Design a protein around this motif. Structure first.
Motif, PDB file in Angstrom:
ATOM      1  N   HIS A  58       0.929  -1.378  -0.032  1.00 50.70           N
ATOM      2  CA  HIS A  58       0.052   0.116   0.016  1.00 50.70           C
ATOM      3  C   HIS A  58       0.962   1.497   0.109  1.00 50.70           C
ATOM      4  O   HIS A  58       2.116   1.107   0.544  1.00 50.70           O
ATOM      5  N   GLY A  59       0.218   2.517  -0.419  1.00 48.06           N
ATOM      6  CA  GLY A  59       1.239   3.645  -0.614  1.00 48.06           C
ATOM      7  C   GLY A  59       0.538   4.623   0.462  1.00 48.06           C
ATOM      8  O   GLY A  59       1.193   4.816   1.619  1.00 48.06           O
ATOM      9  N   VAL A  60      -0.215   5.454   0.116  1.00 46.45           N
ATOM     10  CA  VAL A  60      -1.070   6.452   1.127  1.00 46.45           C
ATOM     11  C   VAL A  60      -2.581   6.169   1.181  1.00 46.45           C
ATOM     12  O   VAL A  60      -3.229   5.975   0.080  1.00 46.45           O
ATOM     13  N   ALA A  61      -2.936   5.683   2.236  1.00 46.71           N
ATOM     14  CA  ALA A  61      -4.263   5.314   2.623  1.00 46.71           C
ATOM     15  C   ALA A  61      -4.952   6.307   3.448  1.00 46.71           C
ATOM     16  O   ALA A  61      -4.264   6.464   4.491  1.00 46.71           O
ATOM     17  N   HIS A  89      -1.362  -0.978  -4.576  1.00 48.67           N
ATOM     18  CA  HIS A  89      -2.020  -0.023  -4.311  1.00 48.67           C
ATOM     19  C   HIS A  89      -1.253   1.394  -4.249  1.00 48.67           C
ATOM     20  O   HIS A  89      -0.060   1.185  -3.893  1.00 48.67           O
ATOM     21  N   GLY A  90      -1.883   2.376  -4.728  1.00 51.15           N
ATOM     22  CA  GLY A  90      -1.151   3.600  -4.795  1.00 51.15           C
ATOM     23  C   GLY A  90      -1.587   4.775  -3.760  1.00 51.15           C
ATOM     24  O   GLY A  90      -0.976   4.770  -2.590  1.00 51.15           O
ATOM     25  N   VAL A  91      -2.687   5.471  -4.028  1.00 55.05           N
ATOM     26  CA  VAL A  91      -3.293   6.562  -2.980  1.00 55.05           C
ATOM     27  C   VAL A  91      -4.611   5.929  -3.232  1.00 55.05           C
ATOM     28  O   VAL A  91      -5.467   5.977  -4.269  1.00 55.05           O
ATOM     29  N   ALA A  92      -5.253   5.679  -1.969  1.00 53.59           N
ATOM     30  CA  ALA A  92      -6.644   5.106  -1.983  1.00 53.59           C
ATOM     31  C   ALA A  92      -7.299   6.142  -0.761  1.00 53.59           C
ATOM     32  O   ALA A  92      -6.686   6.445   0.187  1.00 53.59           O
TER      33      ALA A  92
HETATM   34 CL   LIG Z   1      -2.933   2.994  -0.715  1.00 55.18          CL
END
Ligand SMILES: [Cl-]
Ligand SMILES: [Cl-]
Ligand SMILES: [Cl-]
Ligand SMILES: [Cl-]
Ligand SMILES: [Cl-]
Ligand SMILES: [Cl-]
Ligand SMILES: [Cl-]
Ligand SMILES: [Cl-]
Ligand SMILES: [Cl-]
Ligand SMILES: [Cl-]
Lengths: 63, 63, 63, 63, 63, 63, 63, 63, 63, 63
Positions: free
Chosen positions: I15-18, J15-18
């Protein structure tokens, strides 16, 4: 017997039974009797009999 | 018997039974009798009988 | 018997039974009788009988 | 017998039974009788009978 | 017996039984009696018989 | 200069900066530098300059 | 300069910056640098200049 | 300069920046730099210049 | 300069930014740089210039 | 300069930005740079110039 119910109102706002469930699991609202709701609300119940049973249970689980 | 219920109101706001459940598991509201709710609310109940049972239980789990 | 209930109000705000449950597990509200709620609220109950049982239990767990 | 209940109010704010449970496990509110709640609230109960039982228990656990 | 119910209102707003369920699983609202709801609401019930059973359960699970 | 960083692990569980705030007012987590976080984590910083300022303050209130 | 970073892992679980805020008011997480997060994480920064300013503040309130 | 980053993993699970806000008011997550996140994560930054400013503030309120 | 980044993985979950916001008011996630996210993630930035400004602020309120 | 990025994976989930917002008011996710996201992700940026400004703000309110 005798019952007299007079009432006199200008503004009446009445809720009765309200439920809200969000994201829950197994929510129960259980009422054994009547639900009677009004600006004027009157309820009468008579039960005649040697072995009257009234039972109200939310839930039963086995095994 | 005799019952007299007079009432006189301008503004009446009445809730009765309210439940809120968020993210919960196994929430129970259980009422064995009637729910009677009003700006004027009157309830009468008569039970005649040698072995009357009234039982109200939220939940039963076995095994 | 005789009952007289007069009432006179301008502003009345009445809650009755309110429950809130957040993130909980196994929350129970159990009422064995009636719920009667009003700006004027009157409840009468008569039970005649040699072996009347009234039982109110929140929850039972076995095994 | 005789009961007389006069009441006179301008502003009345009445809660009855309120429960709040957050993040808890096994919270119980158990009432053996009626819940009667009002700006004017009156409750009468008569029980006639040689072996009347009234029992109110929060919870039972076995094993 | 005799019952008299007079009522006089200008503005009345009455809800009866309201349920809201969002994202939940197994939400139950169970009423054993009638639901009676009005600006004026009156309910009468008479039950005659030696073995009257009234039972109200939210849900049963086995195995 | 030279930096060598060898690492060898079977199971590694690493948190970095974790904050939890419940019912609070004005909670601050302030980091002036980088946040670098890994099973193997390496950070290098070089600052050249006659008047370098580094300032890290949680909060300022005036009047 | 030289940097060598070898790494060898079977299972790696890495969080970086995690915040949780419930029912709070004015929660701040402020990072002046980069956030770099990995099973292998490497960060280099070079700043050349006579008057470099780095400032990191959670919040400012006036009046 | 030279940078070498070798990595070798079987299972890698990496979060980077995670925020959760429930029922809050004015929650801020502010990062002045890049966010770089990977099973292998590498970040390089060079700044050349006599008056470089880097500023990271969560929030400003006036009046 | 030279950068070499080798990586070798079987299973990678990144994951990146959640962000998650429920029932909140004014939630901000602000990143001044790039967001770079991968099983292998590499970021380079070069800034040349005498008065470089980088500013990252969550929010400004006036009056 | 030279950059080499080799990668070798069997299963990659990235995932990237969620963002998730439920029942909120004024939720902002603001990224000043690029968003670059891949099983292999590489980003390069070069900025040349005496007065480069980079500014990233979530929201501004006046009056
Ligand atoms: Cl994310
Ligand atoms: Cl309702
Ligand atoms: Cl209600
Ligand atoms: Cl209520
Ligand atoms: Cl209440
Ligand atoms: Cl309704
Ligand atoms: Cl963390
Ligand atoms: Cl995280
Ligand atoms: Cl994340
Ligand atoms: Cl995404």
């Amino acid at each position: 017997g005798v019952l007299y119910v007079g009432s006199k109102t200008k503004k009446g706002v009445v809720h009765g039974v309200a439920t809200v469930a969000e994201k829950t699991k197994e929510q129960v609202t259980n009422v054994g009797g009547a639900v009677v709701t009004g600006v004027t609300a009157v309820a009468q119940k008579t039960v005649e009999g040697a072995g009257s049973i009234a039972a109200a249970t939310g839930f039963v689980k086995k095994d």
